[PDB]
Amino acid sequence: MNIEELKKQAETEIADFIAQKIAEMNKNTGKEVSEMRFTAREKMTGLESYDVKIKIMLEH
Amino acid sequence: MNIEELKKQAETEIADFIAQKIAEMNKNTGKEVSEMRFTAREKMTGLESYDVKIKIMLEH
């Protein structure tokens, strides 16, 4: 499998995982996720992950 | 379960999923993921997901 295909595959997997998490959150809270912040988690050995902060909105 | 706890849970799940994907990619390519770009995928019904673009670096 080539590098491009691996990349597109993982991109789709992550997008799909995030979509499921948002659907789940919206369902469970009765509210709406408006945004997620992603902050790189980097080590001397390189990028490890992104830490996530979920923003949920509600009526004033 | 409260809204805060649900949030922290989903944040951790997403961070962990991304970390696994990066470890996987690095292993499979012999290279290094340097960055991921996240671009909101929004609909009139609200935020659906984030689309992802993975950047991989290699030696000049």
UniProtKB/Swiss-Prot annotation, chains A, B:
Pfam families: GnsAB_toxin (PF08178). One of its GO terms (molecular function) is protein homodimerization activity. One of its GO terms (cellular component) is cytosol. Belongs to the gns family. Overexpression increases levels of unsaturated fatty acids and suppresses both the temperature-sensitive fabA6 mutation and cold-sensitive secG null mutation. This is Protein GnsA. It comes from Escherichia coli (strain K12).
